[PDB]
Ligand binder design. Structure first.
Ligand SMILES: O=C1NC[C@H](CO)[C@@H](O)[C@@H]1O
Length: 439
């Protein structure tokens, strides 16, 4: 039996563009994920977010599912272009209405709302002005955040500025695999910097407008291990500092980028980037870590490449390494000692099938989840201030450049009918929540 602290927060997480559909409904502006996925070749099978889980219409049934499961928290994001169709200026009341109904329903049902201000669907209108490459996005992002705070901060008390800013910067602007689909290393590192400035402006606005709430920021993380006791160990140190929370938490807590990031990337950062660091250290209330996989790494003349290992993998091909989530929780306490931590995403893609009995027998997902929750429990016993854990995802959804081909939900979605079928893993997680732990 592994029981968690009294009042520990069990949740599920989604993102607006992955589940909503109806991206241009009720006066919404286009986002960069709309234009990116409507460009041939960018997304597997030409899939887009036009329909997705149709959550834009089915939101009440989805929340009734969260309730029925006994889940105590719901992490969801707001589409910036639904709220401000040109990114700044005009506010769309029907966009506010859509989220106001979700927020009120959650509160009525006693589910704690965790709102992600930005989960990758930037207004297209702002991308035309350079998007995350433009220093002015710090102002645009502050104006957007202020609207949300003024409108929803009476009810939502837990906020997240950014989801996975490393991915937004590097996968969007260096690898070109995500919107807005660019390949320019100087743009990518300017986006890193501007994401930090915008995050800090939003926190500053939060302190004036929501005097009783808490605000944090969410990072993707991998557990990197070296391919030899040899350059190899440093390559691993590099990957942690670049790919994990330190790229952002070193600025936030210590006022400069991490050592090995500066070594690799100094030339790509704005010349006087240090001028902004005083403002970047704006105090945050919590750190959200996302976590999925482990990676064997070696030096390879970013002077790093991955080595495949004969470990169990998910449908993404991500090696399953549960001790990574213990490692990243311990490491964040050890390096920056944040006052609170949340695991804001943990989950797995498996090739789910509805059996003849009408059920989805995803023991593989149960096994994955159980092992990572066990490792999180361990971190708590050893003093990590972990306040909550969020499963990615409530629903199968639009998995970015993989489209609908990858299923992460604990609830199955039949896209031909939009029917939801709770999977074995969802039933299993519900029991974990009720018992406040494992057994
Ligand atoms: O925030 C996220 N991180 C990784 C998930 C699985 O790839 C993704 O679906 C989600 O948007």
């Amino acid at each position: 039996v592994k029981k968690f602290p009294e009042g520990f927060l069990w949740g599920v997480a989604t993102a607006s563009y992955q589940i909503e559909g109806s991206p241009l409904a009720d006066g919404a502006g286009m986002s960069i994920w709309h234009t990116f996925s409507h460009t041939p070749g960018n997304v597997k099978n030409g899939d887009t977010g036009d329909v997705a889980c149709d959550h834009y219409n089915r939101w009440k049934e989805d929340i009734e599912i969260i309730e029925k499961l006994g889940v105590k928290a719901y992490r969801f994001s707001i589409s910036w272009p639904r709220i401000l169709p040109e990114g700044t200026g005009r506010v769309n009341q029907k966009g506010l209405d859509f989220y106001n109904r979700i927020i009120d329903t959650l509160l009525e049902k006693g589910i704690t709302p965790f709102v992600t201000i930005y989960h990758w669907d930037l207004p297209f209108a702002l991308q035309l002005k350079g998007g995350w490459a433009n220093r002015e996005i710090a102002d645009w992002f502050a104006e957007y955040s202020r609207v949300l705070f003024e409108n929803f901060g009476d009810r939502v008390k837990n906020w997240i500025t950014l989801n996975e800013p490393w991915v937004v910067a590097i996968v969007g602007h260096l690898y070109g695999v995500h919107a807005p689909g660019m390949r320019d290393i100087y743009v990518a590192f300017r986006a890193v910097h501007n994401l930090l400035r915008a995050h800090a402006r939003a926190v500053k606005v939060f302190r004036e407008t929501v005097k009783d709430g808490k605000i944090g920021i969410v990072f993707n993380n991998g557990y990197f291990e070296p391919a030899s006791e040899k350059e190899d160990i440093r390559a691993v140190r590099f990957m942690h500092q670049f790919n994990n929370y330190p790229l952002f938490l070193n600025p936030i807590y210590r006022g400069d980028y991490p050592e090995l990031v500066l070594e690799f990337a100094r030339e790509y950062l704005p010349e006087n980037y240090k001028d902004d660091m005083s403002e970047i250290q704006e105090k945050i209330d919590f750190v959200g870590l996302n976590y999925y996989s482990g990676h064997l790494v070696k030096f390879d003349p970013a002077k790093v490449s991955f080595v495949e290992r004969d470990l169990p993998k998910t449908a993404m091909g991500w090696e399953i390494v549960p001790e990574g989530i213990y490692w990243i929780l311990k490491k964040v306490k050890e390096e920056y000692n944040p006052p609170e931590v949340y695991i804001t995403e943990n989950g797995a893609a498996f090739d789910d099938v509805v059996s003849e009995d009408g059920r989805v027998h995803d023991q593989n997902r149960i096994d994955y989840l159980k092992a990572h929750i066990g490792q999180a429990w361990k971190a708590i016993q050893e003093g990590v201030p972990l306040k909550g854990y969020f499963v990615w995802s409530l629903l199968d959804n639009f998995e970015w450049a993989e489209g609908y081909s990858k299923r992460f939900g604990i609830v199955y979605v039949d896209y031909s009918t939009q029917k939801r079928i709770v999977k074995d893993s969802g039933y299993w997680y519900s029991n974990v929540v009720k018992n406040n732990g494992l057994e």
